[PDB]
């Protein structure tokens, strides 16, 4: 058949799962074939830092910017559904690669 | 070491000045500010001088001074002992 693949990127797991359910819903609204957010890995961009100025290199701290990622493969891309899913609304925290 | 595909580092100032000089055919003491310029055997005629952070040093040239930089012939630090 045919596919259209979405790769969702975020930092909030609650919200990436929220928009996952929302997008799966809006894909289901057309009776169009829907699969689900497969549990695929997440990057972890990590950065160690020192706390204080001018000395005390032994005291440090860590920080960890994760990257929540979800693949959603939509089968049966009826072009009505395609141009509908082109026009979902979301808040700011999530970004999406439509390919 | 200067790579060979790049060739030498002969810098424009003294390269063009010494073009002018050998086309005058005349040789005199000539000052320059570049330690980082590499040496050609075409310098065995002229006398070059360089600055070292305090003042200038002149130096006369010899056959086996080729492939080198002029800073190698300037004393940059003085250590007479304790």
């Amino acid at each position: 058949g045919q596919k259209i693949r979405i790769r969702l990127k975020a930092y909030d797991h609650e919200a990436i799962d929220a928009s996952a359910r929302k997008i799966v819903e809006t894909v289901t609204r057309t009776g169009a074939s829907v699969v689900g957010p497969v549990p695929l890995p997440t990057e972890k961009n990590v950065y160690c830092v020192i706390r204080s100025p001018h000395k005390y290199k032994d005291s440090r701290e860590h920080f960890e910017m994760r990257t929540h990622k979800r693949l959603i493969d939509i089968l049966d891309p009826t072009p009505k559904t395609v141009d509908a899913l082109m026009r979902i609304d979301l808040p700011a925290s999530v970004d999406v690669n439509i390919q | 070491p200067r790579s060979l595909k790049k060739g030498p580092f002969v810098d424009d100032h003294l390269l063009k000045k010494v073009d002018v000089q050998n086309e005058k055919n005349t040789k005199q003491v000539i000052k320059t500010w570049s330690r980082r310029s590499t040496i050609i055997p075409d310098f065995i005629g002229h006398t070059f001088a360089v600055h070292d952070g305090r003042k200038h040093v002149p130096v006369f040239v010899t056959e086996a001074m080729v492939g080198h930089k002029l800073g190698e012939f300037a004393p940059t630090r003085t250590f007479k002992g304790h």
Binding site: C48, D58, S59, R60 | -
Partner: protein, 126 residues
């Protein structure tokens, strides 16, 4: 089908335990092809040693993760758990030597200010 797992410090192995002979096959090879380490062989054998059923139950493995000794402990673990699927009645005599537990002892986080896990820099007093 019969399938159980073994994991020791990032050393995972799956197992097929069949009622045949004791034929060992470990990723296109056997226990005498890999593992030139006899203490490791003892580990690998200790469950069948325990039940006295050495050469009563074929085993087929797929090694991945960890190094040889981690893989070894995971192997013997999975073989014992498969024997428990064969029959649990022998289990409370296997806890008598405890050849059944996952090794709850993994490598440690490396800390800051120091040289590794617990080796501190030389507290110099000059």
């Amino acid at each position: 089908p019969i399938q159980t797992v073994g994991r020791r410090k990032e050393a995972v192995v799956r197992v097929r335990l069949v009622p045949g002979t004791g034929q060992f096959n470990l990723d296109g090879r056997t226990l005498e092809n890999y593992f030139p380490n006899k203490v490791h062989q003892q580990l690998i054998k200790a469950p069948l040693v325990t039940v006295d059923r050495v050469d009563q139950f074929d085993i087929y493995a797929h090694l991945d993760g960890g190094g040889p000794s981690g893989q070894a402990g995971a192997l013997r673990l999975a073989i014992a758990r498969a024997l428990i699927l064969v029959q649990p009645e022998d289990r409370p005599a296997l806890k008598k030597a405890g050849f059944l537990t996952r090794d709850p002892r993994a490598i440690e986080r490396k800390k800051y200010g120091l040289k590794k896990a617990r080796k501190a820099p030389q507290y110099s007093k000059r």
